[PDB]
Amino acid sequence: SHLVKCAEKEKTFCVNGGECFMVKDLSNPSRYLCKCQPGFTGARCTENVPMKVQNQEKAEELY
Template sequence: IKYSRRGTSPTLPPLKSEHFKPCQEKDLAYCLNDGECFVIETLSGPHKHCRCKEGFQGIRCDQFLPKTDSILSDPSDTLIYFYHINSYFCIL
C-alpha cells in the first residue's frame, strides 16, 4: 500500500520482516507443549514470544484448552452430567 503526501510516497514495510527472528538454540525450551519460539526485535531490545500448537494458549503455551464436546455444548446435557457426578459422590 502506498500513499502520497506532497510529492513523497512512503511505503509500508513488508509483512515479513527482519524484526521477527527464530529463538537461539539456548531459548528453544522457552515455549512449552511444542510451541514455536520466536524473537521480536524492538528499540527496547529483543522479546521472546511463542506460537502455540492447537489446544494450548498463554505467553509460554502453558495453558491447556480442552476441546468442547456435546456435553459442554448443550447446557441441559451439562446439568444432567453434573447431576450424575453429584449423585455418584453422594453414594460414596
C-alpha cells in the same frame, strides 16, 4: 521487528511444541512472540485448553 527464531537456550521459553520467535529490532531486550500449538495458553504456552469439547468426556470425542 522481524520474527527471528529463538536460539536453543531460548527456544524452551515456549513449551508444548511452541514455535518461539523474537521481535528483532534495536529497542527491546528480547521480547518474545511464540506461534504456539492450537489449544495452549499462558506466557510460555504451558497450560493446555479445550481443543475438542473437552468436558463432554461421555461424548465420542475421546474414542
